[PDB]
Design a protein around this ligand. Structure first.
Ligand SMILES: Nc1nc2c(ncn2[C@@H]2O[C@H](COP(=O)(O)O)[C@@H](O)[C@H]2O)c(=O)[nH]1
Ligand SMILES: Nc1nc2c(ncn2[C@@H]2O[C@H](COP(=O)(O)O)[C@@H](O)[C@H]2O)c(=O)[nH]1
Lengths: 828, 828, 279
């Protein structure tokens, strides 16, 4: 939506493409509301106050100050993510292709030969995390940087099994200049970066579920988190594999040895974090060039100590040019040891040189056992060729990709992988692992058992919703659990399909109303950006991979008009009402017809009902950022605004009817889901065949009438005959809000056959309040019909006569017994 | 789109929902273009000239003057159709439901009992054609009236076989306040009203194909038109029907006798128009109340002469209260006779009263034959019960609906239906016609044989495209034919589906490129509104029942920038470029990558190619109002603007690539459809391995270089050695447009391996003209590659160096022989 | 699958359309197994023992004895349901249309004017439950009767809001001679008839869920069952309804007063059974 707030005396409207203008000083949050229901994508907000920007930025709507026009305004056009507490703009613009470069955020790729393999004239540069080395280009009122990088192209290529690179990047560079910017994907690395370091301090613990190599680096300075994912591959499960022979396969023009050397270490550490919430010393041998070190130090600071003949530019201590051979007792315990002692064949005979590779492998294991023989908290990660070896069963294999597959895989070990566990593995049982099994993830820790906990702050962002997880176990994990941040997918389709996918995998799909939480928000992506200190410039789409977010047990459940609020509620309706092929009164006509006020749709300008909810139900696909359920519970019990209980049912009933004609079975369910939850948090009682009624007499009715005493039957009630004395309290306590309300009549109509009446206006708000004061005093009041206030005139069938809006005022009020000869109260 | 032009000194921007503002005086044509590529639906145009409104209104964009704010501006919000030559606004607002009425445009329904059968409190009123009796409510700078009526509800109900009316209207009134305004359907009755009376005078003849009861009244003052439709039902085809017995069926609460009495006459007339191109006297008997007369006189003026005992309010001469019995020679020939001599049973015994009904029927036929025995040009339409009768084979039966089916059907006769043609029909062969066959259409004239004609101005608006018509015959009717106005459906879907429908019937679907017309427009609905004097406020949707319109042989083929012009061309692109999830340079990057200028996408701000067409190809679903084909043929031969031939191929080639990734096989076809039509109206030749070239030398190159003589190879050509003397004309005739063009260089790049070059800018427009000048002199010039102008510097591989934009100027120009030692021309 | 067991010395293979033959004495249940994995729909089983037929009939495979060829074999071609303990064949053949009749199992429709409203020449007759008045036509080694009736056409027409009957039946009679015999639907009324009376005497208390007017008559001699279904419409829920006026609507050429007079009583009873397990 991208609100751009411009200087009062310096501000221009030009022939732009998606620009509305807004300017007012009515009330701060009412202004932000009126903005947030505006249609277009780019809005100029000419005279402003900081609090109107606060509310929007809190609502996930990116709203920012603009002080100048030449570059501060033209470059903040493009889409972005805004941290509204440190005033940093994370742009997501792929217009940097124009000066003919790609850009990464990993230093190691710069030292490859890759620029030989890019298209002619292109380069890569500006290597910083989130583009934090971009900010040197711009000089604004705010800090700014373009976090768009092409990590996708390079990393997918490695996992792509394709060999021509120019063909590859030319394909993908054309995909972005064709298809939609995936913002929900780029804003997450921003979100993840600030999401954990505050969460860890606030709760003192955290568990994450399903981390992928999106987060290879997020957690390197967080030992005290415990991540769970797909389990590892074990030596225990090589016995499955069919035998196979050397397969010389090349899948990368440019050498990516530094990438696996980075991953195998990183895997080794998250393992060490899994066992001992700790963080180690990191010894190394055989790995000099190590341009992947500087990538690591941008996140967490580790002590790297290396033994290699060649240059290690990035380390604390490069101890020797000798490679660590048997001086092994000189190591500290709190450690990991990464062994990559190797060789390179020259032109020597492969059949005889193979003998050398076998002997190193025997040695490299002897180093591993002697390491793990003495001290506790020691983790190894050792180099192996594919030959017959005696390996521990419970150990974990790794084959992160490389330049080319030529018979080697790495093994990592723990202290208990030595304690009397050993198996013999044949040769071709390893090649069968090498050649077909690519390791996918450095996070090889055990799966998350789906059950509630009370010490755990559980995060689960894109791990659950998979079809293979028990639906009810995740539901109960969400309902019967405090302390979390869970994400699940919304049922964004019609005909209520419970499982939705890509023709590869299906995922479980939810509505908001699957969950009877106790104190929790259930909002969208943009809403939770606001909760955690962020705001985004692009709105969510009605279809696509939208996801419910669920915050349990948080400080912000009571702060309703701040976070996950009624912002954005009517944005799509206004499009339908005025523009997209309908009359402006379409919603004002339908809901009265569907609630049996179909004779009268004149007074549907004002005094209609079913405001917030009817929009929340039929356009949930757009505005599920508004947690409807949280809105209702906090008005059951006053913890601004107030509507009657009755109005919410009519909002539900009309959405059913609407979804019936449309045949949108998902709204139709969602309407059923709500209305019996409305009848849950509070009951509703109906004096269907009442005994008493509240009546209002007037001085003079400016119409023709044959009924001997015209009156307004203001409401009916069914009570016991000694709760009159506490009904009259309310007759008394609001006597002037009835004498003081603008009763007006302007016309006659036909309420029904043989019942010719007037219309009364301007009274309902008092009628809705009265309903609530009788309510909490446990007094029945009102019928299941819609109370349309009317003054009876005659039992005939006549013509609607219009007069000027003539004010009527109250003779008296009275509480009358139906078919009785006496009353007991009448204010005056 | 609804352009609203506001007063200069009286004009307000407020917190509205779909408002851009535009204001400029750069150009009249160029301003309307910039408007027409604006996104939103409602545009305020603050300072204006009449010609900018003319162009838009001519482009189908409704653009109107606004002089005041209170009601002239607030009520012109809603959608409408505008006749920009008489300044009449036809609104299409269904907000008249609020004062609780429906509205018709047929006087006869007001005299029914229907208001007993409407929902309680509702009425019907304001009965005028197109709402021409609405204009008394509004006092504006323009004439105005709300042509929205509820004829749908009433007429469908009659053809609906449902009996409860309150249930019916409540259903349909809720359909409109739910679903999209069918603006295209509503604007046609406006279109049809002014479409024919001018067309008839201009060509002196006209044939229409597939008229429905949308047009019961359009043609009543047009004898000289010859309509064709589904043939009639004949007595000849009762021999099929199984025997059946009396079926007492009631399908209308309210009496609709006046409706069939209206239809049977109207059928009788269009028949008489079919036989003789003249228009009759219209005698009647048995039909007094005849409140349907006033409906007829609002369109065409006929002489009605009636014989009935009861009151005929609306007629010329109600001759007698006796009903026309045997004084039959006293009738004029040029006539139709409508017989409805009948009775009404009281409480008499149905078994004996039936004998009376039989005798009238014998009499009513004797009247019919005695009528058609004497004079020529006489038609009848007679009342019959279902009994065994001796009927002419070739006669035509009618059972337009009624209140209730109780055994009667009407028969119409022509002069040749008496000349020795008679058959015996059994009783139940008529009930089987009555009870199951509802007549659908008063237009019972023979079908249109699908073949070309040269005297015929053929209209065909929504009759063709049906799956049962031979596709090629309608194609050839469109291609091999002048003098017409044909409509066909567009292939608005993807994966190139040739036939599309509603799961009831399928219809043939076209692209614009199915047709090699000679002088014809192929545009949208809104474009042809402009051509005929109309403009509409709502844009067409990318999917839905869009239809190509085809105007053959019209005066407006050469007037390109007026009608069916490049208006609206980039509206959807601007949405994609800036807002809907992409960088603004996305289109500027893709088309260079897809045309092998992928090394360089820096100079894609300006000097890119493929402007109009690439947008016409991938977003044809939005902007098929622009006839791409007409645009190209009129630039092949100059009959403002000019682009080279080369640019159009690259526009086509890139749309293919675009549609390949997307897998939109319809653009992919449409690209193939165009490019070989580009190679049709004009050839393109390529000096792929040339002999000569045009070279340009400069004073000094502000770069490093190792080539001994840096030069711009401005273009290459393959010619004979004695067409040098007419090549040199062109260099001489444009020597200063080369000396006078802003040659500039700003950087170096890699054109290819071992070719390090500079970039030249600002020259291409002269290069494109030069290609055109050589072209028509039949000289080869240019290669199939894209000519990216470059100055060679060195045969190495180096780094892009940026400098300030430094102007370079021309030493000389020269025409050089490739690997030769001499030249023969050099300007200076 | 329709196993037809033929006499040893009297048995013929002819040029038939879906016939395998099987004959062996290996082992009783191994033989039935080998049969039950045979492809075709009609199987001749030439020399047999009763226990091989028992197993199949217990397996849901209809397997029956055939003693003669002229009519006991040619008419047991068509599809059927077999009660293998009382040896009754419930045929499901709609070939009775050929002698130009429909057939019901409710006596009241015969006293209407409906034969004025059938297609010319047709009639209705043979009104018995499950066609239990059909068995007078056939003289077989087993009891037999054609339980195919056209209750669908008549009852749907009443619930159809359509008024022309000849048009109606001609439509539906053509649906059956077009589409597949719904056997899983016709065999249930057989199933329901014997399913409950034995359950009742075996289990002291029973309850049924979602009965429809398939079973208007199944339960009339079972008070001690407690059926549950969609709740009633109450006077309590008229307050919803919009006001409306007399609507004269005719949806049945022939008078069906006897049908509602039957239903209103029957409703009244199952109610009385619901309150007081009584009759
Ligand atoms: N009673 C009530 N009315 C509201 C509330 N919010 C908006 N409205 C009404 O709904 C209108 C919405 O205007 P719109 O967004 O359709 O232009 C407001 O102008 C106001 O009349 C609310 O919270 N409570
Ligand atoms: N050569 C040429 N360029 C055009 C033509 N029409 C528009 N353009 C270019 O395309 C641009 C379109 O701007 P946009 O509508 O994308 O903001 C114009 O500003 C102009 O540079 C045309 O007819 N010929």
């Amino acid at each position: 939506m991208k609100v751009l707030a411009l200087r009062h005396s310096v501000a221009q409207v030009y022939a732009d493409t998606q620009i509305y203008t807004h300017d007012d000083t009515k009330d701060s949050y009412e202004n932000a509301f009126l903005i947030s229901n505006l249609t277009t994508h780019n809005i100029l907000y000419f005279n402003y106050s900081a609090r109107t920007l606060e509310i929007l930025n809190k609502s996930g709507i990116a709203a920012i100050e603009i002080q100048s026009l030449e570059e501060l305004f033209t470059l903040i056009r493009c889409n972005f993510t805004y941290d509204y507490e440190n005033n940093v703009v994370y742009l997501h613009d792929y217009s940097y292709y124009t000066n003919n470069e790609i850009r990464t955020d990993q230093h190691w790729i710069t030292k490859t030969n890759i620029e030989e393999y890019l298209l002619p004239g292109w380069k890569l540069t500006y290597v910083g995390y989130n583009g934090n080395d971009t900010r040197g280009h711009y000089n604004f009122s705010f800090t700014c940087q373009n976090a768009a990088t092409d990590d996708d192209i390079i990393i997918e290529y490695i996992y792509s099994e394709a060999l021509d690179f120019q063909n590859f990047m030319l394909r993908k560079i054309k995909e972005r200049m064709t298809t939609s910017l995936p913002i929900a994907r780029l804003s997450n690395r921003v979100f993840r970066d600030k999401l954990f370091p505050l969460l860890v301090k606030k709760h003192k613990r955290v568990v994450n579920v399903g981390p992928r190599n999106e987060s290879m680096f997020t957690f390197l300075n967080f030992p005290s988190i415990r991540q769970f994912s797909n389990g590892p591959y074990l030596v225990k499960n090589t016995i499955k594999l069919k035998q196979e022979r050397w397969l010389g396969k090349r899948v990368s023009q440019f050498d990516i040895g530094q990438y696996k050397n980075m991953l195998n270490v990183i895997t080794t550490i998250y393992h060490y974090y899994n066992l001992y919430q700790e963080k180690p010393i990191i010894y190394m041998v055989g790995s000099a060039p190590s341009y992947w070190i500087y990538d690591v130090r941008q996140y967490s600071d580790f002590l790297f100590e290396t033994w290699d003949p060649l240059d290690t530019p990035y380390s604390s201590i490069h101890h020797k040019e000798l490679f660590f051979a048997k001086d092994i007792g000189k190591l500290k315990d709190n450690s990991i040891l990464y062994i990559d002692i190797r060789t390179d064949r020259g032109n020597a005979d492969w059949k005889e040189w193979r003998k050398v590779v076998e002997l190193q492998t025997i040695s490299n294991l002897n180093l591993a056992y002697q390491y793990l023989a003495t001290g506790k908290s020691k983790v190894c990660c050792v180099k192996l060729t594919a030959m017959d070896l005696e390996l521990p069963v419970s150990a974990k294999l790794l084959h992160h990709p490389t330049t080319e597959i030529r018979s080697e895989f790495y093994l990592l070990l723990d202290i208990w992988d030595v304690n009397n566990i050993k198996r013999f593995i044949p040769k071709g049982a390893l090649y069968s692992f090498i050649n077909n099994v690519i390791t996918d993830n450095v996070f090889i820790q055990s799966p998350f058992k789906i059950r509630t906990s009370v010490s755990d702050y559980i995060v689960a962002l894109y791990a659950l919703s998979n079809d293979f997880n028990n639906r009810e176990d995740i539901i109960n994990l969400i309902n019967n659990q405090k302390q979390s941040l869970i994400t699940v997918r919304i049922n964004n389709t019609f005909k209520d399909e419970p499982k939705v996918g890509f023709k590869s995998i299906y995922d479980w799909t939810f509505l908001p109303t699957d969950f009877e939480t106790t104190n929790a928000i259930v909002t969208s992506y943009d809403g939770c950006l606001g909760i955690f200190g962020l705001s985004i410039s692009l709105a969510s789409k009605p279809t696509g991979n939208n996801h419910l977010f669920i915050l349990n047990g948080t400080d912000k459940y009571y702060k309703l008009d701040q976070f996950a609020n009624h912002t954005g509620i009517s944005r799509r309706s206004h499009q339908v009402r005025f523009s997209e092929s309908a009359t402006s009164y379409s919603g004002y006509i339908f809901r009265d017809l569907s609630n049996s006020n179909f004779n009268l749709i004149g007074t549907n300008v004002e005094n209609s009902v079913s405001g917030h909810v009817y929009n929340a139900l039929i356009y949930y696909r757009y505005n599920y950022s508004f947690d409807l359920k949280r809105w209702i519970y906090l008005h059951s019990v006053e913890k601004y605004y107030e509507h009657a209980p009755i109005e919410l049912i009519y909002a539900c009933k009309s959405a059913k009817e609407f979804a019936s004609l449309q045949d949108d079975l998902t709204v139709l369910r969602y309407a059923n889901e709500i209305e019996n939850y409305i009848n849950k948090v509070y009951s509703i009682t109906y004096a269907d065949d009442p005994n008493y009624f509240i009546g209002i007499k007037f001085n003079n009715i400016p119409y023709i009438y044959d009924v001997k005493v015209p009156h307004l039957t203001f409401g009916v009630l069914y009570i016991s005959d000694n709760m009159i004395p506490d009904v009259v309290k309310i007759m008394k306590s609001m006597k002037q809000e009835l004498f003081g309300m603008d009763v007006t009549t302007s016309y006659t109509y036909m309420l029904s056959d043989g019942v010719y009446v007037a219309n009364v206006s301007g009274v309902l708000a008092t009628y809705f309040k009265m309903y609530n004061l009788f309510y909490k005093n446990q007094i029945t009041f009102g019928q299941s019909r819609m109370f349309i206030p009317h003054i009876t005139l005659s039992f005939s069938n006549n013509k609607t006569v219009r007069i000027e809006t003539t004010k009527l005022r109250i003779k008296s009020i009275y509480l009358r017994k139906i078919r009785g000869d006496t009353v007991f109260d009448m204010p005056e």
